[PDB]
């Protein structure tokens, strides 16, 4: 298959500046001077919308700030100047030969100034514990950029494999994110330990923040 | 005006079958190559199957992931293309789109709104709702966070409101995660004045349309 390497997976650009999204094909997508590379925009809940066809041609009604370039194996979609309704997923897609293949996608978001998260920790409820499972939740509220390291420790033992993270979409008014990390243990494993800690590293914090509790302490 | 309309998605168990249908309007359908493309819960696009024209002997193509399990066909008289899916697998879960032409040189294309497929051994089940109680240790700044953990439901989605929709500012309802058990979970959180914690009542209203259930949970200091 023609494999498309799309970069970056996540792109933050300031409104008014240029967003450049790239796609490398594993082999040429050219036939007779035409480069069969398409670009799509996808908004949440909606189907893909064709922006650029055959590498460099704007679709009908597509705004002039979208443009495409490239040939052979190397292609870019350029959005300049970026506007707020350009936040979306973008995908390249080769139309040279079946099987039709797509890049992995780029999520384009709005770049804003750094904002440190507020961090909170929630012990499992008494109601859930009697059910046989314990969920411990660490919340990072209203931060930017999205990159953060959230590390669970149980009596100082670094946890791995037993937590899942979820992140909100960028806030429409302040452009920040919030994130949950949820540690899942058996009721039995939870009652084996005393100190539950969530350590958060983020560019907005001069020193990584630990929130912790002693099991059963109001 | 050209429109493509998909139908036939829904819940199914692994090993089961479903047939999707796509009806085209406003186009000379017999002249159009038709493809199905799916989108994972991860939000990526994957081409599934294509069928060509009568003049091309209705040539069909399949992604290796679906070869021998899916069958694409068309009925030019009804401007429709179909995807029969057999021996379904969890990884076939996703939104399925009908599109044309996808391949070759084209200055315009068409896509439906999509139809959803969820392949799972899980039974439909409404969520258990647990409080994320505001901490009894003080905050430096006088804002407190609290929430509801909405756990062990199937299929998606749930909706969460706070105080019957009166509380919307500061609310974050996270995307669900599929747990190793095959059931989904998420939390909804809100930030409130810590000085309201003894005065203001906070209740999360959790609706799960697939089970036709609603759960209200009051969230108090422990």
Q: Is the same domain home to B68 and B93?
A: yes
With an 8 Å Cβ cutoff, are A59 and B136 in contact?
Answer: no
Q: How far is CA A92 from CA A72, A74, A162, A200, in A?
A: 14, 11, 35, 35
SS3 B77: helix
Q: Is the same domain home to A28 and A98?
A: yes
Indicate the DSSP class of residue A187.
H
Tokens of A127: 């109601």
Domain count, chain A: 2
Question: Which of A2, A62, A119, A139 best tests the B interface by mutation, with the highest count of B CBs <10 A?
Answer: A139
Closest-CA residue of chain B to A177: B172
Of the candidates B109, B85, B87, B86, the one whose C-alpha atom is nearest the C-alpha of residue B98 is B109
A residues 6..65 contacting B (CB < 8 A): 34, 36, 40, 42, 46-50, 53-54, 57, 59-60
SS (H, E, C) A120-182: EEECCCHHHHHCCEEEEEEEEEEEECCCCEEEEEECCEECCCCEEEEECCCCCCCCCEEEEEE
CA-based nearest distance A106→chain B, Å: 10
What's phi and psi for B15, nearest 5 deg?
A: 90, -15
Q: Is the same domain home to A100 and A161?
A: no
The approach used to solve this structure was X-ray
Give the end of a domain, one of B119, B151, B186. B119
Q: Is the same domain home to B111 and B139?
A: no
Q: Is the same domain home to B10 and B100?
A: yes
Q: Radius of gyration of chain B from Cα atoms? A: 23
Cross-strand bridge partners of residue B76: none
With an 8 Å Cβ cutoff, are B130 and A135 in contact?
Answer: yes
Say which of B44, B103, B132 has its CB closest to residue A105: B44
User: Would you report the helix, strand and coil content of chain A in percent, each value rounded to 5?
Assistant: 5, 50, 45
Of the candidates A9, A49, A104, A5, the one whose C-alpha atom is nearest the C-alpha of residue B44 is A104
Question: Which of A40, A68, A88, A98 best tests the B interface by mutation, with the highest count of B CBs <10 A?
Answer: A98
Say which of B61, B179, B222 has its CB closest to residue A98: B61
Tokens of B79: 């401007």
Of the candidates A72, A55, A76, A67, the one whose C-alpha atom is nearest the C-alpha of residue A11 is A76
Q: Is the same domain home to B102 and B134?
A: no
CA B140 to chain centre: 40
Closest-CA residue of chain B to A122: B132
User: Would you report the helix, strand and coil content of chain B in percent, each value rounded to 5?
Assistant: 10, 50, 40
Give the end of a domain, one of A85, A110, A135. A110
With an 8 Å Cβ cutoff, are B107 and A127 in contact?
Answer: no
SS3 B221: coil
Q: Is the same domain home to B114 and B210?
A: no
| CA separation for the pair A105, A42 (Å, rounded) | 10
Q: Is the same domain home to A106 and A137?
A: no
Q: Is the same domain home to B149 and B175?
A: yes
Q: Is the same domain home to B27 and B72?
A: yes
CATH of the domain at A207: 2.60.40.10
Asked, as a colleague might, if the bond just before B155 is cis with ω within 30 of 0, I would say yes
Of the candidates B178, B38, B62, B37, the one whose C-alpha atom is nearest the C-alpha of residue B120 is B178
Give the end of a domain, one of A61, A78, A110. A110
* Residue A193 neighbours by CB under 8 Å, 6+ apart: A154, A155, A215
Domain count, chain B: 2
Whether residue A95 contacts residue B104, with contact meaning beta carbons closer than 8 Å, is answered with yes
Say which of A99, A118, A127 has its CB closest to residue B130: A127
Say which of A125, A135, A139 has its CB closest to residue B145: A139
Give the end of a domain, one of B92, B119, B146. B119
| CA separation for the pair A25, A3 (Å, rounded) | 6
Q: Which helix (H) or strand (E) holds B96?
A: strand B94-100
CATH of the domain at B190: 2.60.40.10
Resolution in A: 1.5
Q: Is the same domain home to A18 and A89?
A: yes
Of the candidates A123, A140, A145, the one whose C-alpha atom is nearest the C-alpha of residue A216 is A123
Q: Is the same domain home to B136 and B97?
A: no
| CA separation for the pair B194, B141 (Å, rounded) | 9
Of the candidates B156, B201, B192, the one whose C-alpha atom is nearest the C-alpha of residue B174 is B156
Indicate the DSSP class of residue B29.
G
Q: Is the same domain home to A45 and A82?
A: yes
Give the end of a domain, one of B119, B140, B157. B119
* Residue A211 neighbours by CB under 8 Å, 6+ apart: A119, A120, A121, A138, A197, A198, A200
Residue B167 structural domain: 128-219
Residue A34 structural domain: 4-110
C-beta atoms surrounding A72 within 10 Å:
14
């Amino acid at each position: 298959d023609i494999v498309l390497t799309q970069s970056p997976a996540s792109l933050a650009v300031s409104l008014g500046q240029r967003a450049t999204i790239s796609c490398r094909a594993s082999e040429s997508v050219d036939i007779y001077g035409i480069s069969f590379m398409n670009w799509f925009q996808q908004r949440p809940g909606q189907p893909p919308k064709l922006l650029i066809y055959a590498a460099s041609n704007r679709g009908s009604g597509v705004p002039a700030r979208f443009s495409g370039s490239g040939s052979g194996t190397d292609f870019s979609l350029n959005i300049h100047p970026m506007e707020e309704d350009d936040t979306a997923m973008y995908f390249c897609q080769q139309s040279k030969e079946v099987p039709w293949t797509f890049g992995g996608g780029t999520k384009l978001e709005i770049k804003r100034t750094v904002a440190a998260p507020s961090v909170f920790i929630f012990p499992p409820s008494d109601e859930q514990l009697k059910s046989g499972t314990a969920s411990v939740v660490c919340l990072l509220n209203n931060f930017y950029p999205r990159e953060a390291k959230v590390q669970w420790k149980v009596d100082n033992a670094l946890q791995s494999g037993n937590s899942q993270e979820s992140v909100t979409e960028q806030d429409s008014k302040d452009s920040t994110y919030s994130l949950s990390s949820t540690l899942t243990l058996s009721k039995a494993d939870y009652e084996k330990h005393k100190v539950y800690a969530c350590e958060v590293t983020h560019q907005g914090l001069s020193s990584p923040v630990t929130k912790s509790f002693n099991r059963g302490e109001c | 005006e050209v429109k493509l309309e998909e139908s036939g998605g829904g819940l199914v168990q692994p090993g089961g079958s479903m047939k999707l249908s796509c009806v085209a309007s406003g186009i000379t359908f017999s002249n159009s190559w038709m493809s199905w493309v799916r989108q994972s819960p991860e939000k990526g696009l994957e081409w599934v199957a294509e069928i060509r024209l009568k003049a091309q002997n209705y040539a069909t193509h399949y992604a290796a992931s679906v070869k021998g399990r899916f069958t694409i066909s068309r009925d030019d008289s009804k401007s429709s293309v179909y995807l029969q899916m057999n021996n379904l697998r969890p990884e076939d879960t996703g939104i399925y789109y009908c599109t044309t032409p996808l391949g070759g040189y084209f200055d315009m294309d068409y896509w439906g709104q999509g139809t959803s497929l969820t392949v799972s051994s899980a039974s439909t089940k409404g969520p258990s709702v647990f409080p994320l109680a505001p901490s009894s240790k003080s905050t430096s700044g006088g804002t407190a966070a609290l929430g509801c953990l909405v756990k062990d439901y199937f299929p998606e989605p749930v909706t969460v409101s706070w105080n019957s929709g009166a509380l919307t500012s500061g609310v974050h309802t996270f995307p669900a995660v599929l747990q190793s058990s095959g059931l989904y979970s998420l939390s909804s959180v809100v930030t409130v004045p810590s000085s309201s914690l003894g005065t203001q009542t906070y209740i999360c209203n959790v609706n799960h349309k697939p089970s036709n259930t609603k759960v209200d949970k009051r969230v108090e200091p422990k």
